[PDB]
Amino acid sequence: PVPCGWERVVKQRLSGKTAGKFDVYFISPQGLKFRSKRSLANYLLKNGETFLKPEDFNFTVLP
DNA sequence: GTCACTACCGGACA
DNA sequence: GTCCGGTAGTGACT
């Protein structure tokens, strides 16, 4: 599927020599756009890790 | 070498 | 944000 919080966009070319071809790109949770597997792989090298802390979870109900 | 194809990314657009 | 084209790379080959 699509990794959590990420978005996948699919498009099809409609004119010119490349009509009918498809373009795919991804949007990260922070809104960074990747048009290629190469630029995304490069980004993932150092940025693919995600961490969690207790403070990220709310166990309380307000008034 | 040519052909067919896939992938990346430049850059036009006002 | 919208959109296509030019180039590089790969691999099979009458």
Side-chain angles (χ1 to χ4, degrees):
Chain A
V2 180
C4 196
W6 287 72
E7 183 191 353
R8 180 187 195 243
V9 176
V10 174
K11 284 186 166 287
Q12 177 171 64
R13 308 200 173 184
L14 295 174
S15 61
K17 299 173 300 180
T18 60
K21 280 181 169 294
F22 290 96
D23 299 277
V24 178
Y25 72 74
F26 285 86
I27 309 176
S28 72
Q30 289 69 224
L32 291 185
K33 178 178 167 184
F34 296 92
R35 294 199 293 153
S36 68
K37 193 177 205 69
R38 174 185 299 171
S39 77
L40 176 50
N42 178 77
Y43 169 80
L44 256 27
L45 253 30
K46 246 65 186 303
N47 302 279
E49 274 183 320
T50 278
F51 307 92
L52 295 173
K53 300 185 183 192
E55 67 186 40
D56 299 343
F57 296 83
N58 194 170
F59 280 90
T60 65
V61 171
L62 303 167

